[PDB]
Amino acid sequence: RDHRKIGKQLDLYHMQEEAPGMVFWHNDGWTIFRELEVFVRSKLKEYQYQEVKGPFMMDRVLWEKTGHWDNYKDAMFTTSSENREYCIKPMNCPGHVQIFNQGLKSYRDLPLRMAEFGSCHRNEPSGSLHGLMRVRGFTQDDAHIFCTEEQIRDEVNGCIRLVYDMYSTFGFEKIVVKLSTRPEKRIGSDEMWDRAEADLAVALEENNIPFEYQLGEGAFFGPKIEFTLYDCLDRAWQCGTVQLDFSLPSRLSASYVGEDNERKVPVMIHRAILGSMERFIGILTEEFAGFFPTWLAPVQVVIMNITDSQSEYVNELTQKLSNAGIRVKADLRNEKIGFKIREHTLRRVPYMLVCGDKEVESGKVAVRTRRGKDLGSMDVNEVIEKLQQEIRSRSLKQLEE
Amino acid sequence: RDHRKIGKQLDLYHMQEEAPGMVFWHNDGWTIFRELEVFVRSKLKEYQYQEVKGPFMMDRVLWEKTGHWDNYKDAMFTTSSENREYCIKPMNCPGHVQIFNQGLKSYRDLPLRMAEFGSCHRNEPSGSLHGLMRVRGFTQDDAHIFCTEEQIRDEVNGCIRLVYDMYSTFGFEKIVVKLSTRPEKRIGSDEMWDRAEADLAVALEENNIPFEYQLGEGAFFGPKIEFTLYDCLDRAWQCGTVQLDFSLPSRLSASYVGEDNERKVPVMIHRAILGSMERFIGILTEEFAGFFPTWLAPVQVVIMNITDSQSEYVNELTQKLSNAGIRVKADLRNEKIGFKIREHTLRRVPYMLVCGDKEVESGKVAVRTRRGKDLGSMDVNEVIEKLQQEIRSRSLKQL
Ligand SMILES: Nc1ncnc2c1ncn2[C@@H]1O[C@H](COP(=O)(O)OP(=O)(O)OP(=O)(O)O)[C@@H](O)[C@H]1O
Ligand SMILES: Nc1ncnc2c1ncn2[C@@H]1O[C@H](COP(=O)(O)OP(=O)(O)OP(=O)(O)O)[C@@H](O)[C@H]1O
Ligand SMILES: [Mg+2]
Ligand SMILES: [Mg+2]
Ligand SMILES: [Mg+2]
Ligand SMILES: [Mg+2]
Ligand SMILES: [Zn+2]
Ligand SMILES: [Zn+2]
């Protein structure tokens, strides 16, 4: 049930000591990663987010200005060029503010929602590293919303709504919500912290979401709503996060022209829905025990012959399913079909299509699933249509399941 | 036609002194980048490439094994953690070999084609930096092909075919090819360099490609075919490249079980088709003067109302085009229609749809282009279909 064991069995990724906490994504794990990006992007479109890309590193001077240097230096990787020191970014917020700061902004531009699949590096103590769930290089499905104070309620509500909308696709039954309050080391006044923490609490109450406080776990610049998911040992992992920030835009000289023609500082909401792709894939792997929903499955269909007699027909069906957009592979090896089926079951391939002479003559396929079910013979075109529907709806459940 | 001025005018990206040579991709520039990735991914499905992702940093010891720490040192960003030294990767090859080395490989797995949109960082001298063309952090449409000696000819041919295939989509008329031979600092024996250089020259001749030698410009591990594209000032920029490598696989302990059941070392072909996304976008921006073909345009369609009476219709049209897969925006601002049209024309939006009362009553739309052509009233579904055909085919010219 451990995602590290399942990841090896399905050849999803590996890690090695030449790059501690750094993931090597193999083809099949990168397929899952990419499908999750496509899913997130479909939500970015619906909820009207920009998508940007900030640089990997920036001058230490800028990280000093935010307060990251004093409050985050231990976790930061640094490098140098031509007598200047750079920080590899542990967070995407300063880069998004650099983009916001190009060009004059008006209240008419707000709320401005700016998303990034943002690569973060944090020098986590090597003793704390754990598979995909705690790594040193990870990719957040991050975004920063620049808004007015009057827009905070609506924008925080929109993030909360987005979290439950995305999580319902995966069928999560245990989502534990925490409000992380001010940490001992922080910037911003007590009055600003009281306001930000109340805003989050009222937003959760308004959505009728039960939660508990988590004292001292907020960011150095603002409080957080945390959406907690659980692994196979029922350990709590922080995934989704909504953060309210009255401090960083001021520190980074962000402003916009208000209705009054006065210069104003935007509020910034930070949020990640999945958290990081790495930690979320870890959670999905354990939650599903490697039985990824068909739309996520690295290989959705394997087509297999009984003998070389049906090998041409298998090759035609494989091209046909591939042209219909299905991740399909042919298994033409000189092995018994029971052997093949057991192997692709261990690989958690949703569907196995067996082609005997009966199947070749009729243009049909015998359908087996990774759950051990025999689904009988079906017409090829009906199978394709059913798989396409299963994939496009991102269905959690297989045919006749 | 300088891509840096166009990039500012169209809000594609920016750069600043807090990160020399590092691009901040804005929404519209990042849209072009992502469409190029979609295009590349479509071609690699066709040619049966895997797609992977390696880590950003690995131990200095690994870069010593490859010979990079000695042949590539001062060009590399280095960092530390818990008394170990790491290199931010300047190339993707060692990571791809690490993935190849996971699990027993046989001749049945070859050729194994492994692609990555590989983020590279190189400490280029700050005085050499230029716009998007020469940056310190960039993304290569990289791949490594592991193959046998007998498979070299076919695999190099496939890379050359891929370059001309993908470049024809953009209509490039000037593609100059170079063969870069052994540099002063290299790994691998002279006989291996003789054979690698001959293999690439034969490949170019067999593909009917006139080329010029570039003595001493090969990679430290092997010679390269370089595909050169030219900017507005006719400066030469290396974009696509094919590199033949008989030495890195052995240094990194790559092997496969041959048909005879003995251990053998694969040959590696390195190749990038576009080169880097940053540099290729720079070239495209100058080549098209910011009039990106519709399939690449950050915003493909803007729909505007003349008065508030049509605002509802414009919103229904906008949702309909967006559901048909078109990058479309509604412009409902309290501005004169002639102000709105000019704004989106200057932003080089391919198609502008104007809705007055007669368009609403008829279920039609008045269509004009960024070049000033007035297409008149058209049926909505006719516009969507023509737009979809222009995008699906990645057509260079409009309606
Ligand atoms: N080391 C890490 N490995 C993997 N994912 C991470 C890591 N650190 C953070 N994330 C993910 O990024 C999200 C947003 O980042 P944030 O700065 O809020 O995390 P965090 O509070 O430091 O997390 P944690 O308490 O788990 O260390 C987290 O909710 C988590 O999903
Ligand atoms: N500093 C850079 N900025 C942008 N793109 C680059 C840069 N260096 C290399 N590339 C791109 O990556 C491709 C493959 O990398 P490779 O190591 O072969 O380049 P290169 O020979 O060092 O390039 P150049 O001669 O332009 O310095 C190049 O052909 C080019 O398109
Ligand atoms: Mg942390
Ligand atoms: Mg935390
Ligand atoms: Mg170079
Ligand atoms: Mg060169
Ligand atoms: Zn942030
Ligand atoms: Zn390489």
Numbering used by the authors:
A (entry chain A): 242 to 642
B (entry chain B): 242 to 640
From the paper:
Aminoacyl-tRNA synthetases (AARSs), a family of essential protein synthesis enzymes, are attractive targets for drug development. Here we present five unusual crystal structures showing that threonyl-tRNA synthetase (ThrRS) is covalently inhibited by a natural product, obafluorin (OB). OB contains a β-lactone ring with a 2,3-dihydroxybenzamidyl moiety attached to the α position and a 4-nitrobenzyl moiety attached to the β position. When ThrRS catalyzes tRNA aminoacylation, the Zn2+ ion recognizes and binds l-threonine, assisting in the l-threonine activation reaction.
To test the mutually exclusive effect between OB and ATP, we engineered a ThrRS_Y462F mutant that mutated Tyr462 to phenylalanine to avoid covalent bonding with OB. As a result, in the TSA experiment, OB only increased the Tm of ThrRS_Y462F by 2.6 °C, while 36j still increased the Tm of ThrRS_Y462F by 29.7 °C. Consistently, OB failed to inhibit the activity of ThrRS_Y462F in the ATP hydrolysis assay up to 5 μM. More interestingly, when we cocrystallized ThrRS_Y462F with OB and ATP, ATP was visible in the active site of ThrRS together with two cobound Mg2+ ions. No densities for OB were observed in the active center. Without the binding of OB, the conformation of Tyr313 of ThrRS_Y462F was in a position that would clash with OB as it was in the ThrRS-OB complexes. In addition, compared with the ThrRS_Y462F-ATP structure, OB induced a significant conformational change to the outer side of the active cleft, which was similar to that induced by another potent ThrRS inhibitor, borrelidin. Therefore, OB prevents ThrRS from binding to all three substrates, including l-threonine, tRNA, and ATP.
